[PDB]
Design a protein around this ligand. Structure first.
Ligand code: HEC
Ligand code: HEC
Ligand code: HEC
Ligand SMILES: [Cl-]
Ligand SMILES: [Cl-]
Ligand SMILES: [Cl-]
Ligand code: NI
Ligand code: NI
Ligand code: NI
Ligand code: NI
Ligand code: NI
Lengths: 106, 106, 106
């Protein structure tokens, strides 16, 4: 999928996590976020279209998805342990990573 | 172990995963793959032997193992949940990463 | 927290893991290490204070925390399976990563 579609999936499922009651719901949403983030990681964003694929900016963009995916994985571990509110809090804190990448590259 | 020996371990255990019936077998193979990939990550491949250790090519080579290890870890999570066929499908899709690194650096 | 405080947390909890009897104790310590390492990852160490934030040295410093966090996560998986002595051995081997970063940047 393209970058915007993956971002819609990330955005939608963050809201699913916020409204969830139980860990199964949180885990299903995190799994979809993980897939969307993995697919977005291969994108070239509009503001970097000319940069060399070996450029520091493209490498940093990809590192942003590594951070997001790592945090999603941590939230998934919490969900697997049934720590719903802790998983929801980790997902809430993902937003810092979304915003940081957006400030540089969106 | 050297790079070729770790690649043999990766290759052999990918076939173990393909032929497996149950998650214990898949998990044992993925664990061996994770160890081989972690050990290969420190290798300098023949086609990069002269490049500076701080070079973009050596950094990219190592990022290739980060990708592989991340995907192995995801397959391991699926195996831990008893999703044998989903774990086998994730392992099958690892091959895209093996091939991509081979195209650049083997 | 600052870098030194996060390093104290890493150091203290490595000793907790060494003295632990059971996986709950090991897991609690690894969780604190993961949080300290994630927080240290954003630090600029004294010996790199002038370097550009886009510099290879700052990027390599951050990759050192990626390695540490990955190894902590592997030890946590072992602890989750109740493999206390294997988790303790993985944590013992973390020290190679602590030392390698210290040799370059401390
Ligand atoms: C590492 C980079 C990065 C991360 C992390 C990231 N984004 Fe984005 N996001 C972008 C870029 C680049 C765009 C602009 C896409 C475009 O203009 O085509 C974007 C666009 C969007 C959009 C607008 C989509 C549209 O229809 O135009 C939304 C919503 C969004 N992001 C939400 C999120 C959420 C939620 C997260 C995390 C949970 C997130 N983003 C994490 C890079 C990132
Ligand atoms: C990030 C880099 C990278 C990844 C990922 C990677 N390889 Fe390799 N692989 C290499 C390189 C480099 C060589 C060449 C080694 C040499 O010539 O000494 C190689 C060689 C091999 C060989 C030949 C071994 C021999 O005896 O000569 C096999 C088989 C192999 N890889 C299989 C795999 C499989 C299976 C995977 C994933 C499951 C994989 N590789 C992933 C870099 C990689
Ligand atoms: C990727 C880099 C990196 C890793 C990994 C790392 N350290 Fe450090 N560590 C540093 C740096 C840089 C300093 C120096 C901090 C300063 O001088 O302010 C330091 C300082 C320390 C100190 C001295 C703290 C003090 O009070 O002055 C201790 C103890 C320590 N590290 C232990 C550890 C342990 C234990 C680990 C792993 C389990 C570890 N470090 C992993 C970079 C790292
Ligand atoms: Cl795209
Ligand atoms: Cl080698
Ligand atoms: Cl600091
Ligand atoms: Ni896509
Ligand atoms: Ni070796
Ligand atoms: Ni990098
Ligand atoms: Ni801090
Ligand atoms: Ni995990």
């Amino acid at each position: 999928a393209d970058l915007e579609d993956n971002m819609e999936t990330l955005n939608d499922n963050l809201k699913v996590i916020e409204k969830a009651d139980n860990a199964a719901q949180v885990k299903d949403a995190l799994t979809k976020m993980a897939a969307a983030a993995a697919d977005a990681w291969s994108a070239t964003p509009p503001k970097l279209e000319d940069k060399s694929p070996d450029s520091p900016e493209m490498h940093d963009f990809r590192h942003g998805f590594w951070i997001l995916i790592g945090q999603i994985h941590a939230a998934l571990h919490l969900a697997n342990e049934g720590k719903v509110k802790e998983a929801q809090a980790a997902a809430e804190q993902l937003k810092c990573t979304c915003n940081a990448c957006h400030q540089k590259y969106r």
